[PDB]
């Protein structure tokens, strides 16, 4: 045979732009924390392997709540962990002498950037059996179980540009491609549906079996 | 020293786009004759030398009388001396089977062309001590003193494209760069302000002295 | 180790476009004097070193006061020190036979230019212990202490293009990158907040200590 195995490799499997966030502005600014595990289709793929190391291509598709496009100037700003957050529509942090920023209209084609692998460890990890800090571990401290500090990539804050208040509503949709991917230690895939963003907890009253059950054993 | 004398040469001094005309449409067409000595900043530069030989880069910036841009199709047409002029909004001369023409909307970036040196003599001249024709020279014929025929480059006529009448107002602004310039015989610069387009006549009741006068001679 | 020290060099530290001015048009023209020390984030960076020599990349992002973009033709004009300033919406100085100028609509992507190092000295300086002129120095003359003449780069004037009056409001935002930078003589950084543009004066009733104080020592 001459069946090729090119388009089943690891790089071709992940290079598809999947939705990761929907950011809505119903003061004209938001401070969206970063968590890219809030949508189930890309999350089930990325949690096949334990450790992953990659770059990315983010794409910001912005429109009004019903797909209409009106001329409105926006500004996105990536805030690393430690930088001063913006507090109002016109704070001092929107000057962006240190942070990268994109200025794009709503009428333009959607913007694209190419972020690098920016983690302090060798690779990202979607599973972390342990606590990030030392000290006592009583009952009231169990928010941080399975919260590794080397995955929090700061926040990502958008705004409308002017110092007045704009009369339009904004819904941003962010899509992420994965380039130059290397993975390690594959895991069993998920069958129960997802409930939160930070933990694998499941609905204990509804154990969804994997295989759709039948009636007998001698008849399909 | 290592002081450069590159950006004081003749070519670098003239390659700046200066305003030469403002064409207004308050029947939807104009026949602007050509005279590029109607604005004082470029005219004082070009009348430093007697003879000049160059190509040019014309640029047509078109908008409404208050800078607003509406979608409106226009047409510029360069008319050489001898060609049939347009008479109405839709004459037979707008077919342009011989003359060059530019079709550009008002919403587009401004158009650019690159005209060559098209004079019958070796170079243009801004000064002409003499009469163009022969014959008697009485008092009533003194419009043509200092009017050389090898500088009249025909006219330049614009219009709105459609056969109906458009409801918008047009102000065209033309800017001219100068490339591949060669000059000859420098002249004393002008100090009195300009009054007309075709002659160096000045206000005889207001002799503006060159130097701003002071009070004494032994103190500044 | 193989830790790279590339992205901590002097060139990579300054090549980020920071805000330097906000120009508002609430006669349809302004004559904004040049002073690029009016915003505190880029000013604290550039005043780390005493002398600096660089080119720049300016970027003009223009919109209405609430981010809306309407089709409106504009014109920016850089005026060197000595050139005739514009006085009205349509003066004689808008012909621009000598000065550089940018014509760009509000609907277009923002314009970019690349100005060179245009100072008469070898480098810019953000600190100048001295007076620019000679003569008597009495009390009423102390505006010019610490005002070097080889930093004033003229003005920068914008307008709406037409001879009528446009019905829209303009807010321009200018951003400046720094390319091919060479610096000299680093200085202690600033801790007190900024008060003016031309002098390092501080609020004498509020001495902000650098370190956030604690209760004990042990």
């Amino acid at each position: 045979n001459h069946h090729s195995t090119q388009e089943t490799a690891i790089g071709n499997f992940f290079s598809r732009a999947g939705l990761v966030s929907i950011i809505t502005m119903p003061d004209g600014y938001v401070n969206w924390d970063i968590d890219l595990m809030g949508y189930a289709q890309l999350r089930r793929k990325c949690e096949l392997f334990t450790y992953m190391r990659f770059d990315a291509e983010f794409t910001f598709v912005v429109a009004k709540p019903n797909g209409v496009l009106v001329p409105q100037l926006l500004q996105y700003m990536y805030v690393p962990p430690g930088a001063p957050k913006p507090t109002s529509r016109d704070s001092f942090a929107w000057q962006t002498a240190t942070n990268p920023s994109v200025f794009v209209k709503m009428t333009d084609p959607p913007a694209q950037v190419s972020v690098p692998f920016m983690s302090p460890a060798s690779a990202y990890q979607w599973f972390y059996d342990g606590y990030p800090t030392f000290g006592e571990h009583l009952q009231a401290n169990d928010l941080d179980y399975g919260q590794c500090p080397n995955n929090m990539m700061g926040t990502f804050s958008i705004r409308t540009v002017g110092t007045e208040k704009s009369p339009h509503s904004i819904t941003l949709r962010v899509y992420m491609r994965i380039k130059h991917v290397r993975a390690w230690i594959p895991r069993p895939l998920r069958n129960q549906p997802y409930l939160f963003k930070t933990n694998p907890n499941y609905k204990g009253n509804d154990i969804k079996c994997t295989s759709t059950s039948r009636d007998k054993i001698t008849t399909l | 020293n290592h002081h450069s004398t590159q950006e004081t040469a003749i070519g670098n001094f003239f390659s700046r786009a200066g305003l030469v005309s403002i064409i207004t449409m308050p029947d939807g067409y104009v026949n602007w004759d050509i005279d590029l000595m109607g604005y004082a900043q470029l005219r004082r530069k070009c009348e430093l030398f007697t003879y000049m030989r160059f190509d040019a880069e014309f640029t047509f910036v078109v908008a409404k009388p208050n800078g607003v841009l509406v979608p409106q199709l226009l047409q510029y047409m360069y008319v050489p001396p001898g060609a049939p002029k347009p008479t109405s909004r839709d004459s037979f001369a707008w077919q342009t089977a011989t003359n060059p023409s530019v079709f550009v909307k008002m919403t587009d970036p401004p158009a650019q062309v690159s005209v060559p040196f098209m004079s019958p003599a070796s170079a243009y001249q801004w000064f002409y001590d003499g009469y163009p024709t022969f014959g008697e020279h009485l008092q009533a014929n003194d419009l043509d003193y200092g009017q050389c025929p090898n500088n009249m480059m025909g006219t330049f006529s614009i219009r709105t494209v459609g056969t109906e009448k458009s409801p918008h107002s047009i102000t065209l602004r033309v800017y001219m760069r100068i490339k591949h310039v060669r000059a000859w015989i420098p002249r004393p610069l002008r100090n009195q302000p300009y009054l007309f387009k075709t002659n160096p006549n000045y206000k005889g009741n207001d002799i503006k002295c060159t130097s701003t006068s002071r009070d004494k001679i032994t103190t500044l | 180790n193989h830790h790279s020290t590339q992205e901590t060099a002097i060139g990579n530290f300054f090549s980020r476009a920071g805000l330097v001015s906000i120009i508002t048009m609430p006669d349809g023209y302004v004559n904004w004097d040049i002073d690029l020390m009016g915003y505190a984030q880029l000013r604290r960076k550039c005043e780390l070193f005493t002398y600096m020599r660089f080119d720049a990349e300016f970027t003009f992002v223009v919109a209405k006061p609430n981010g809306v973009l309407v089709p409106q033709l504009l014109q920016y004009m850089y005026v060197p020190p000595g050139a005739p300033k514009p006085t009205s919406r349509d003066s004689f100085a808008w012909q621009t036979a000598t000065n550089p100028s940018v014509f760009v609509k509000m609907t277009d992507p923002p314009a970019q230019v690349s100005v060179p190092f245009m100072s008469p000295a070898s480098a810019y300086q953000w600190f100048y212990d001295g007076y620019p002129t000679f003569g008597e120095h009495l009390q009423a003359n102390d505006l010019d202490y610490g005002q070097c003449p080889n930093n004033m780069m003229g003005t920068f004037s914008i307008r709406t293009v037409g001879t009528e009056k446009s019905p829209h409001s303009i807010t321009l935002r200018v951003y400046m990158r720094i390319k091919h930078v060479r610096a000299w003589i680093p200085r202690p950084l600033r801790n007190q907040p900024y008060l003016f543009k031309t002098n390092p004066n501080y609020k004498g009733n509020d001495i902000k200590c650098t370190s956030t104080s604690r209760d004990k020592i042990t």
Partner: antibody
Amino acid sequence: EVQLQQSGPELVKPGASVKMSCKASGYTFTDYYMKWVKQSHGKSLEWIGDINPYNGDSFNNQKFKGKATLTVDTSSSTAYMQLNSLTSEDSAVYYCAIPYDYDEGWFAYWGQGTLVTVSA
Amino acid sequence: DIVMSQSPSSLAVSVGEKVTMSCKSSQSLLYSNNQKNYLAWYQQKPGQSPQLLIYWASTRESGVPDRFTGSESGTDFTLTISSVKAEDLAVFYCQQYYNYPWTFGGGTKLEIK
């Protein structure tokens, strides 16, 4: 939120050229976008132009209704619409309509309108 | 000069539930327009409720009436409201403007309920 007030609606001489003011509610000044209204008595309501002197709309600015559309005076802080006040035509009422943010740009709250009596 | 006509002459309603409008602009430029004042007889004037003829309508009142609605069809139109009783029997009308989205001259013709 609270009510924009006007001055007292009062009268003028057929050649006097007298201003009018529409004293603000109390929140903000000069950041909003002022709009002036003129209606003739057959319920025809033809609008006079905008923001601060940005009043020269589509042919208008002309019957001396809107003539001298002025800027603010900052004392009553919503005062313009100076005119010529011609003989026996400018009999109308005049509304000012400024926005207060959540009523973006267009119409927050109006006044009760100033009747201009040209009756000499 | 350049006019438009909303042409229901009288809405003539017995106190009920359903009623509609149509403003029908005929402006020179055809990309920007937004409309709809209120004009109570007794006292001051609500309004502000914009229907962009071509795309997004309403930058609506999030307060007071939200029962005002939007429109369609590419050609210029504005449409219905809800079931109000003997208070808010007022005279509604569109506004129209020169260059761009602030209130200008052109809100010509009214209609009586």
